[PDB]
Amino acid sequence: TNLCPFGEVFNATRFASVYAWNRKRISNCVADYSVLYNSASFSTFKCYGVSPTKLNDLCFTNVYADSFVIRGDEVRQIAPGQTGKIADYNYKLPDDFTGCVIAWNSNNLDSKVGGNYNYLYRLFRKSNLKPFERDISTEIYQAGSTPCNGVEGFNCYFPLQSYGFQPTNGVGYQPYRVVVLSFELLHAPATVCGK
Amino acid sequence: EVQLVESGGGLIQPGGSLRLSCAASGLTVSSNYMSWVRQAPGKGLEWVSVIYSGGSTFYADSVKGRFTISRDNSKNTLYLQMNSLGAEDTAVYYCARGEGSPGNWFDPWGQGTLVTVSSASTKGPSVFPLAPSSGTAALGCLVKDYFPEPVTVSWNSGALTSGVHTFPAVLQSSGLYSLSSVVTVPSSSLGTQTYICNVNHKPSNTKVDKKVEPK
Amino acid sequence: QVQLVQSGAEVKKPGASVKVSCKASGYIFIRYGISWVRQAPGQGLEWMGWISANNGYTNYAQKLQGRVTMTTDTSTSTAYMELRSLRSDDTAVYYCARDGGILTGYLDYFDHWGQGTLVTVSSASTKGPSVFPLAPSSGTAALGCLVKDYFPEPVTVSWNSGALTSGVHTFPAVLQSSGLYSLSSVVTVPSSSLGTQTYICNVNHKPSNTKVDKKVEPKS
Amino acid sequence: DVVMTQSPGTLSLSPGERATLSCRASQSVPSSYLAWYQQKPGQAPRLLIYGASTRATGIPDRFSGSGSGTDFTLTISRLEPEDFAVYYCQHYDTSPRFGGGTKVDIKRTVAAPSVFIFPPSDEQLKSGTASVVCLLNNFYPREAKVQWKVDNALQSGNSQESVTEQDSKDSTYSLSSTLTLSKADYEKHKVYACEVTHQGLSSPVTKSFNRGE
Amino acid sequence: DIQMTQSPSSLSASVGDRLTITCRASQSIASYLNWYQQKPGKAPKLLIYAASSLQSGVPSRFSGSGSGTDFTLTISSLQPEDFATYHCQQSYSTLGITFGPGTKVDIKRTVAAPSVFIFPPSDEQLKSGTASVVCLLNNFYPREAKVQWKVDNALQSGNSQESVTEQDSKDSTYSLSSTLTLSKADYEKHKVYACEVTHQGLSSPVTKSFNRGE
Ligand SMILES: *[C@@H]1O[C@H](CO[C@@H]2O[C@@H](C)[C@@H](O)[C@@H](O)[C@@H]2O)[C@@H](O[C@@H]2O[C@H](CO)[C@@H](O)[C@H](O)[C@H]2NC(C)=O)[C@H](O)[C@H]1NC(C)=O
Ligand SMILES: [Cl-]
Ligand SMILES: [Cl-]
Ligand SMILES: [Cl-]
Ligand SMILES: [Cl-]
């Protein structure tokens, strides 16, 4: 029984933009959550529907590790029952979410002198995302009566916005890397157990 | 023409409710960030509320739990229900598209509607002529004893604009407002040009046209 | 297939301006940013600045600020670079380069480059070369021709009207401080055939319709 | 919660001069989160500059924004009489916040007011009240003194003053002083006069009328 | 302005060798480091981006590593089409993109000392008012070679330029010309003209010289 590939997610060189968040399926392995509790300076570590001390014992059928980058002020939106541009239009947790949300400051990796163009978020969307939905559409957003046909202009907005992370921004505007763990618990045999 | 038309302001007693309307043409309210911004008399701008296209609503902490933003998709209209109104709520309320965030600023704005929270009673104004005397002459109108604000005054149905000065209203010791609208015209056109001030006091549905002629 | 086709080589005089174009194809022009990187002869690459195709936002390098201008003709999928008050040190090959685009991040890397536009800044006009002999020293010996003070490039040098190519080295042309190009061609030959075999270099400069045949023989 | 304060409170400059409006914060706000709005009297605010430096649509070239971090600057080169307004900076942390605003006044040459006096109307006299209006038209600076004299007796405590905002074209002010009397008290005096003292006048101007004439 | 440096400044290798090129930044650039290949006369081509991820269409023998200030480009087995100049580039500053100086990789061969020749200025050139003295370094390897002019035992500076041929296809050697440019008046005021070559294939510097006149 080999170790679950948590290092590949937490130690990715580059993270995904929140609108195109990454998901890693984790199965048929053995995970170690105790090391993750004291793995670094995880500013956020909130578990929902399960206890972090109990995580090192329970087994699960499937475990998903979703990862992305957001603003510091937006970290509060990665939680059940939240609203905002992130929870509504980029990454949505269900109300009965069973898992943990892990976030840490990454201003030394994901910011650029002059602003980083590499990280984006969906600013415009007609409706809210369903839980765990992923919308990578880059259609020009129609804000008026007349359709756009890929032409930007008045009432025709490119739907994604860059954060422009700079190393000198305040904490609320700095980049934060987020890892969301989900613990699917089906009637199938469990394949992911702690140690 | 893109435009946001506001309506529903006016006088309301303390503790009463009131709904504002922002009728939009040129943008789909349901597809935009739509915000309300108010401005107390003499003070600055304060953000009040926002509704997202997806339906999420947010409120500044000073109104959160008393105001309710909403919209009607078919009517392309933004609403703001204001309950338990008090003195802190007397302001010119503006609607705007956007939320003041990057790629999403407040634009365009509505003309703004005034909400006056007061226990006083509505009263329409009496309009009196400020007749010229006997180069350049001066005449005007006196719009006295009305409540609440505002009163609009034009001359010759908007034909005469140059030289027109309409003074801000002053609160008289009786609790009723009063102002004057004056205009300087050449002395030679006094006996040939009819000068009429058009006073509109919407709160009391008082439309008054007044002919200002020499004595 | 991504393609960036830049305008042809330019020869400008000191103080004038040059506008280099870059025609794009094979991708959505607006979704990407175009950078201009120049390379002086025998130097490293140097980022002049960049232009975002959607909005027209520009960032310039501080030493070119106020002297360079980049524009985007979205109607013809063409980017332009304009450099004014040209000096001699602006002589370089100028590349356009698209980045990964708004989705992967503007300016994060340059995945496609144009073929390059050579811009030569010199005070000189079209001048034919002077050809001087490199006298063979008094068993292999070397002789050659000095092709000096011509403009613009290029000259072509052959020996004995093409009958002698073995052991020939024609060097790259340098741009002297005068604004004129210089170059020399040499060939090693048997030290025994000096006073018997004739060695003539054939210099041809098409930009001036100049054709010089110079005999190289030992000096007495 | 980033708090942003504007300075100065009010700015007074002549046309053609350079206006410097500052907006400073208690946190390094990125330039992309900063915006400026211009509100002229009676009108709604207008988006002036967004992204700290990007001029909005239809905004003249003289308006330019710059600054980053904890200090942002609105520059109005070649100031014009129509630039009379209040300028608000605005940013977004977890909600939209507005600055306190900076009022931009416009200096001009001293202009003496044109003084006019108006007796009450017969229509108003039939109602039982009498209002006497004194008009000071198109003057500068705003400091003016209006004294009411009724039968040569200085009256105070029964008049109110209203001043217009600075004119968006000539940058002058206008002022009205309204003496409020009852019909009974009005018919008891003959000579009504308002005395205007102003910097543009070498001596005070008095405009008077006799009741009935 | 972040400065990018590369080492070695030049590199000799054979087909099948494991090549390693180092890039250094004057301050931390995180992972915003790219590698480019450039062959003579052609445009640069992207090899590595994000310090270690491979571009589409690039062979698997190319790899990158590094984060912060020290970065490494590795070619596991060199192929003939890999001899070129390799540049690194930082994208940490979107206000000032900077490149490394470039490391040229050439074909390794055995040492070969240059054949050194010196040519006095022709009498035809002296009639024009300028004197050019040419020193020729023919068929040598490696590329590193120092050429020093001595006019009456006095080193010259700022008055000589040198051109080099591309590495030869047959014997993989170089040839270099050093041209000392003097004014006609300056040239006639001295007698001994010499060019001294220092090369790896010479156990001691070779000096070819002439006296003006003889
Ligand atoms: C990815 O991890 C490497 C190495 O981290 C090691 O394993 C971790 C689980 C943790 O236990 C670390 O303490 C281990 O060192 C990181 O590289 C290290 O970076 C630090 C500071 O930059 C440096 O002092 C170390 O020498 C590096 N270690 C090695 C082996 O190179 C790397 O930063 C991580 N990547 C990301 C994106 O976080
Ligand atoms: Cl938000
Ligand atoms: Cl779940
Ligand atoms: Cl009013
Ligand atoms: Cl202007």
Short mmCIF file of C-alpha atoms in Angstrom, two decimals, chain A residues 83-85 88-89 121-128 141-145 154-155 157 161-162, chain B residues 2 26-28 30-33 52-58 97 99 101-104 107-108:
data_model
loop_
_atom_site.label_atom_id
_atom_site.label_comp_id
_atom_site.label_asym_id
_atom_site.label_seq_id
_atom_site.Cartn_x
_atom_site.Cartn_y
_atom_site.Cartn_z
CA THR A 83 -21.99 33.77 -1.86
CA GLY A 84 -19.73 36.06 -3.86
CA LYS A 85 -17.98 36.15 -7.24
CA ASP A 88 -21.19 31.95 -7.36
CA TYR A 89 -19.15 32.02 -10.58
CA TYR A 121 -11.43 34.50 -12.21
CA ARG A 122 -14.85 34.58 -13.84
CA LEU A 123 -16.39 38.00 -13.21
CA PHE A 124 -19.54 37.66 -15.36
CA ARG A 125 -22.00 34.77 -15.52
CA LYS A 126 -25.77 34.62 -16.07
CA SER A 127 -26.37 32.16 -13.22
CA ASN A 128 -24.59 30.58 -10.26
CA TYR A 141 -20.71 38.04 -22.01
CA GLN A 142 -23.92 39.70 -23.24
CA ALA A 143 -25.00 42.39 -20.76
CA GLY A 144 -27.57 44.08 -23.00
CA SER A 145 -30.33 43.14 -25.44
CA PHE A 154 -20.39 48.15 -24.55
CA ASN A 155 -22.52 45.52 -22.77
CA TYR A 157 -17.53 41.93 -21.68
CA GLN A 161 -10.59 39.12 -14.99
CA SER A 162 -6.93 38.93 -14.07
CA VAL B 2 -28.68 53.82 -22.35
CA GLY B 26 -30.08 49.88 -22.92
CA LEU B 27 -28.93 47.15 -20.51
CA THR B 28 -30.51 44.01 -19.07
CA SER B 30 -30.97 40.62 -14.85
CA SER B 31 -27.59 40.20 -16.58
CA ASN B 32 -25.64 42.87 -14.66
CA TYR B 33 -24.30 43.82 -11.29
CA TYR B 52 -25.76 39.92 -8.81
CA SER B 53 -26.97 38.48 -12.10
CA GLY B 54 -26.95 35.05 -10.45
CA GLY B 55 -29.18 36.37 -7.66
CA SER B 56 -26.76 37.00 -4.78
CA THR B 57 -27.52 40.15 -2.79
CA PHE B 58 -25.26 42.17 -0.50
CA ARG B 97 -24.75 49.32 -13.07
CA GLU B 99 -20.28 47.09 -8.16
CA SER B 101 -14.79 46.47 -8.49
CA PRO B 102 -12.20 45.97 -11.26
CA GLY B 103 -13.81 45.50 -14.65
CA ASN B 104 -17.10 46.30 -12.93
CA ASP B 107 -21.47 53.05 -14.86
CA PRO B 108 -23.88 54.29 -15.92
#
